[PDB]
């Protein structure tokens, strides 16, 4: 009888001056009152939610966290002052420098890595040292405090050295090695990494005869691969990353004024960031015009450089089209239709593959 939900009341009687007695307060009631009464309210069912309590050691000011208004930081003789700066509080008046936050061993390690990676000597030992430095960056389990510095360093090097293919290649390799370390939480920095890579993919000028073109096209291909990796890995925690990348690349692609290298980079980026459906829905319907107002004048050129550019651009477009998926003479009939839809220059190349699934996929969006 002690699980009752009724309130507990006490009544007081007197045995005399200063002699009180207490009894439980009860009262006789009818059965009509008890039986006819309404039931209590049903609570809602169990559920759970999620939110970020802290990010890199700082609590954000979101509705799900407590307000600052309403004893968490040490204030003894030995407590560091820079600790108050690590909590991100506003009233802090102390501004730590690099030496107050990073240990000397980590600073020496950063300097050694940067010295090793940016060496242009052709000696074999230097190549081995560069590979060892890249492996160290890719595997070391104690580089949590140098991540912002790595991102800032890559950004700075790309920004100030756009006329050096070697340095840009090294920066791309370093960026690839950083995002492959399994001990690092990389989500918040994802977009910060996507800006340098993009600059290496659609920049009008890269570097300052054939070897230069080899280097430029290899760098663009590597940038596209890295962009694909970044978009695949970090596309869910950065909700608007994929549409933004796809829109940027598409805007660059549909521009007859750009030189062929930028068009090659743009189509590679569209394929890398959007996907198969992006190519199917956004690229194919516009190809019929593209091959007439862009590809024909370039084809009409006779210089060897023009030939190489035309071949590279056509190959890139063909690869993008093939990326969608990976009967006798009757089949050829279907192929003919493609030459009507994708135009001669690309339609012929796609039909020469003698593929049926690709043909059906391409034809499925003819109405668009």
């Amino acid at each position: 009888g002690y699980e009752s939900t009724r309130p507990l009341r006490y009544g007081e009687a007197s045995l005399g001056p200063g002699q009180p007695l207490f009894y439980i307060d009860d009262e006789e009631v009818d059965f009509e009152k008890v039986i006819n009464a309404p039931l209590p309210k049903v609570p809602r069912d169990m559920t759970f939610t999620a939110h970020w309590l802290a990010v890199e050691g700082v609590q954000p000011s979101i509705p799900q966290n407590p307000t600052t208004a309403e004893d968490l930081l040490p204030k003894g003789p030995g407590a560091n002052p820079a600790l108050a700066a690590l909590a991100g509080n506003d009233n802090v008046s102390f501004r730590p420098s690099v030496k107050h936050v990073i240990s000397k061993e980590l600073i020496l390690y950063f300097d050694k890595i940067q010295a090793a990676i940016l060496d242009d000597d052709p000696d074999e030992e230097k190549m081995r040292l560069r590979q060892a430095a890249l492996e160290s960056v890719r595997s070391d389990p104690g580089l949590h405090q140098l991540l912002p510095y790595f991102v800032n360093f890559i950004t700075n090097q790309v920004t100030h050295h756009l006329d050096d293919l070697f340095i840009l290649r090294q920066m791309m390799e370093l960026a690839e090695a950083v995002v492959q370390n399994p001990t690092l939480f990389i989500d918040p920095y994802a977009s910060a990494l996507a800006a340098p890579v993009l600059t290496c993919l659609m920049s009008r000028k890269l570097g300052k005869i054939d070897s230069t073109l080899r280097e430029q096209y290899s760098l663009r291909e590597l940038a596209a691969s890295l962009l694909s990796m970044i978009a695949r890995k970090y596309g869910a925690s950065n909700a608007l990353l994929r549409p933004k990348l796809t829109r940027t690349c598409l805007k660059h692609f549909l521009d007859p004024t750009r030189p062929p290298a930028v068009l090659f980079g743009a189509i590679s980026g569209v394929a890398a960031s959007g996907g198969p459906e992006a190519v199917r829905v956004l690229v194919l319907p516009n190809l019929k015009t593209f091959d007439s107002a862009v590809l024909q004048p370039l084809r009409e050129k006779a210089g060897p450089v023009a030939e190489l550019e035309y071949e590279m651009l056509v190959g890139g477009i063909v690869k993008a089209v093939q990326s969608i998926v990976g009967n006798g003479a009757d089949l050829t009939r279907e192929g003919e239709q493609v030459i009507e839809f994708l135009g001669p220059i690309v339609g012929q190349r796609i039909a020469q593959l003698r593929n049926h699934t690709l043909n059906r996929s391409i034809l499925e969006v003819r109405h668009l």
Binding site: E277, V281, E364, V365, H367, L368
Partner: peptide, 8 residues
Amino acid sequence: AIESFKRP
């Protein structure tokens, strides 16, 4: 949206 796009 993809189905709508595929709709003739």
